[PDB]
């Protein structure tokens, strides 16, 4: 058994068959699998021919935009010591990676960048989603706009003396027009002051009623000095039709932060085409657990 079914010397068989048999079986499987691969490739090519290069057919799973930030938190927590420098390195590295894309050297010339209103403005339509006109043009977003969190003055961005920053960003969606709430009698408390129609407001607060007192002064930095996103940087025409496109950003400095205590800060954007979800904690809003232990 063990030895025979492996190699016999009378029938000159190996594993069970002769030399020509293993060849017949190998050749059959090679032809079969080759036909299988060719058919699968053809059925995938017809698919590639069914889709368009300038627009995703289905855009319903990304209707309510998200709200991400610059620091990379493992559990949405920012904990670092003001003494040990090797504690907030993972944060600064990320922050830097994000801001490193807004360098002025990258934004230069007439193509493809265009100078836009230094003050919030309305939408701008560069035509349809076609290839007739060449590569569209995107508005320039300068670093310096973010005043104390830019890595140009204090590279660390704040983490050095107990005053961290948080650069918030709205998820890029093709053909999405942001719409803010109107001045009618129904509007949250916060939003009343500085109702620039052209600005999408972003406002952070405390998850629990207690934590309010322990949170100090939320100082927002943005385009024009407002705490929002200018509508002029929309809509997004997609990578193919707008490479070298920069999305607005909003800096948030959490000055006067209580020391040695976990603070839960929830940031939230307001608007018509914006809706939150009890399951996805990043849809429209976001949570951060800051703890500047020193």
């Amino acid at each position: 058994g063990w030895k025979k079914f492996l190699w016999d010397s009378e029938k000159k068989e190996f594993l069970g068959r002769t030399g020509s048999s293993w060849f017949k079986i190998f050749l059959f499987y090679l032809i079969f699998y080759g036909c299988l691969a060719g058919i699968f490739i053809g059925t995938i090519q017809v698919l590639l021919l069914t889709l368009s290069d300038f627009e995703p057919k289905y855009q319903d799973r990304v209707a309510p935009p998200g709200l991400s930030h610059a620091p990379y938190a493992i559990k949405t927590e920012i904990s670092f010591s003001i003494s040990n420098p090797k504690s907030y390195e993972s944060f600064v590295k990320s922050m830097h990676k994000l801001m490193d894309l807004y360098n002025e050297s990258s934004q230069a010339g007439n193509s493809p960048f265009e100078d836009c209103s230094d003050t919030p403005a309305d939408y701008i339509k560069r035509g349809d989603l076609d290839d007739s006109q060449g590569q569209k043009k995107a508005c320039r977003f300068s670093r310096m706009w973010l005043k104390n969190c830019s890595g140009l003055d204090d590279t660390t961005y704040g983490y050095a003396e107990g005053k961290p920053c948080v650069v918030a960003k709205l998820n890029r969606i093709i053909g999405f027009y942001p719409k803010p709430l109107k001045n009618t009698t129904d509007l949250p408390e916060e939003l009343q002051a500085n109702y620039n129609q052209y600005v999408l407001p972003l406002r952070c607060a405390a998850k629990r009623e207690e934590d309010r007192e322990k949170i100090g002064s939320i100082e927002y930095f943005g385009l024009g000095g407002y705490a929002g996103f200018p509508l002029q940087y929309y809509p997004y025409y997609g990578k193919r039709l707008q490479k070298k496109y920069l999305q607005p950003l909003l800096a948030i400095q959490f000055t006067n932060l209580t020391q040695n205590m976990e603070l839960r800060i929830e940031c939230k954007v307001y608007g018509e085409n914006i809706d939150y979800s009890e399951k996805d904690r990043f849809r429209g809003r976001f949570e951060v657990k800051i703890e500047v232990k020193s």
Binding site: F32, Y33, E55, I173, I174, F282
Partner: protein, 993 residues
Amino acid sequence: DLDELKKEVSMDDHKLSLDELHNKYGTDLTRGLTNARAKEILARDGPNSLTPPPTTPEWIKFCRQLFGGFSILLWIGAILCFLAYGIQAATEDEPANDNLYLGVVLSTVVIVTGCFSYYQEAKSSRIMDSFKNMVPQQALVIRDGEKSTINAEFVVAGDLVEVKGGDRIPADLRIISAHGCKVDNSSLTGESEPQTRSPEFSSENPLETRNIAFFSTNCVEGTARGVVVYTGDRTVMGRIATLASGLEVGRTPIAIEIEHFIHIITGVAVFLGVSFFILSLILGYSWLEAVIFLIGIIVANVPEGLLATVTVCLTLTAKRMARKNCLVKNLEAVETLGSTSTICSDKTGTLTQNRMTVAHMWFDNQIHEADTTENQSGAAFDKTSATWSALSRIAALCNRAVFQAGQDNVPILKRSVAGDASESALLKCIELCCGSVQGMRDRNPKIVEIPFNSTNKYQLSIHENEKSSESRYLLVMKGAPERILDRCSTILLNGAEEPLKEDMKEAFQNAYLELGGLGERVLGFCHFALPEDKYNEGYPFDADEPNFPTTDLCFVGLMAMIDPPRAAVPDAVGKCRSAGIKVIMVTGDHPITAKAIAKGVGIISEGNETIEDIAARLNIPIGQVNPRDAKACVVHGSDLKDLSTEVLDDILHYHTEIVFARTSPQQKLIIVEGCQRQGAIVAVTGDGVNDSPALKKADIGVAMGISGSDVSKQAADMILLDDNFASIVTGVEEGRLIFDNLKKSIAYTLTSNIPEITPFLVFIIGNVPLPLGTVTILCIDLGTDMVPAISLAYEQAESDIMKRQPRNPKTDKLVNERLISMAYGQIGMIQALGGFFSYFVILAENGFLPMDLIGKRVRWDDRWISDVEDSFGQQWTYEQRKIVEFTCHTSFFISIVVVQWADLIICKTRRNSIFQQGMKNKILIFGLFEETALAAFLSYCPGTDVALRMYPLKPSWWFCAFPYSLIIFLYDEMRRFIIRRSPGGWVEQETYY
């Protein structure tokens, strides 16, 4: 419990005297034992009652069903799942509970299967318990000189015991004085006729001598006395029962097939696991992850639903058998019949009816045949001549037996008749075709009679003549044909009378040898009309002197009789021989009768010849002829005792029609073992206790239900509650049908294994988002798939199954490489490709093109990256991409169902085409409809994306697997075509399961 001392042939002290016997055990031949001494022995050795069988608590057999071979594999799978969960828990945070769910599911599956199988075997046990009817019995013992009837459990060795016709022999007695006492040794020794028990010794074999009574035997007619020689378990049938209980069980063929199947499944599972373990280690992953990968692949390569499917398949074939009155105690004993290739049968009680019946009759120089079948389904014998009427009057009058009171309900043949067997058969035949014998007897008053003398060997009697015109006297005598022939001078031909010239005397001699050679017992009936002038109506013929003319009588005709076989015995034997099953007769009866029954049932085909037949046809000694020219052989037990192992092997290797006669139960067991030693499956069919050691050691035992013994009924595996022998043919047919169906169902349940493992393999090698989730694999293996696999059992035959030769056990297996090459190699591959196609389509329509999917798993899984760029530049949060992945799992599961449609259709038939067989299986159609409805329900029902994580699909996706399904159908259709046109070609020795 020394088995060798129980395997030996019975010994005894028969060859002794009455003085030596009384001097060895101690007992007064005329006064018996004393009460004090009787009780001293009763307490010294034990009551005369067999030991009860070894009981069995219900939790023990429930634990037995919870284990086995398949259930053990599922048990190790659950253990492995919990081990991997413990690891993931101690090594990382947020451990996915997938493994724990899979483990509790496997454990529940094993428990449910055990409960179902146990319930079925318990059902059979209850219906089996409703047959043991044990009424207490008391014997007649003589102590201190007085007769007393005491319980059978109080008889000891040495006391005197008296028996009377109608009672049962309590223990093993040594006859000391008998008065025409006959005994029925059919259950123990298998002797069809009543052997007379005489105080004298006659044969060296204790089973052949007449001075020994046996346990469980009944005294037909007469009275006798005897000293209890053997008592309790030490009796003959006690040692036989103890030997039967002290034998092993074995291991059915279906179990061995399941074992080899698990062997192949584990081989390919551990191979794919160790290989992808070395590969994962060669790509960088850590040890902690590689171990989980190995366990995941091994656990994934295990058919969980195949256990319930196989159990239901076997149960389905068992209920039909129970509908035709064929009950199986176990569950796997339903397939052994189909794999049998050598059936060892018993004669008395199994091949025959064990009841004497009038077979042939002689009258008007012509042999006439009578119907000897239980239900009386045959040909009449021309009841229109006067000769027959005279014969009916002779037999109905010169007979002292009468039906037992209160039988007005049972049929004419199954009623109880008090008297000898010959007189009973005659009475039954007359009551069958001549109306009520009670009126035929009261119509003619019997005046003077005369019993059966040992000298006269004839029974005569005179009665009045019912003729209202003739007041003469009728005389009727019956006896041996030679004695009666020497007392006649006339012959009743067609009614008239004629002389007894040598012409009819020679025709009577040829008729005597014709009925005698048939193995039957023939008698002669004659009568005479006494002249009323020499013997008036008032003269009394006292039985003292010669008042009747012994000679010058009128012979009417001979009457033969023999025990006939059961109705469907010849047809069933022929059907078994047609299927290539070797029929070998094994019985402890006389060879002269065994050979005749063998030729009458088909064991010894007409035309074949034995060495003695050739020596008789040539008129030369037997030592000259060559034994190779004889196809059939009759092996005597006495000669079997002195035969080596090689001789028995040669006997079975050179003779096709073998008949073992005068074989003891131990020899029956030796024959069964001699048949197994070669390599063929054996099925033993019996009824008495002598078959118990043969039914146990055989691969499958078939015991009779009505005419069977309790010991052989408890030691057998299949019971024939109706005593119909055709059930054997039905069983051998079902055993094959369910085998080809098991093959089809196994290939069906194994084809899906590939499109359930390939996604994870491409997930680890290509780093793409997980294609097939775990709750979808569970919804497939334990959901939809169950109904179709169960339906595959209801498939009818393709060709004649009762025509092909028995399957070879050493070459034709149940799961060969030809199946693995199809399920794992060709169909499963196409199904996996279809699933991946639907996958890529779903991800391409939402924004993730195939070029950007390779290399995303690291960020696609990360829970803290809320900005994943797609092929178009959009940013997707974690939960949004997870929702898309879940929708891909739902569509993958639906694609699996779509390809399973064509897989179930190509699995319906193994060789034939669909346009030939036909879609007449309604269960399969219902399976397809339900399989689709369940998938639609699991996807569209609200609250499923929360409980099971399955999102709704868009009507355009459901059509991504259709081309693959039709292609599968076309490929298998052309496959099952070259096999038909080209028999024996490459496609057959490569893809023909």
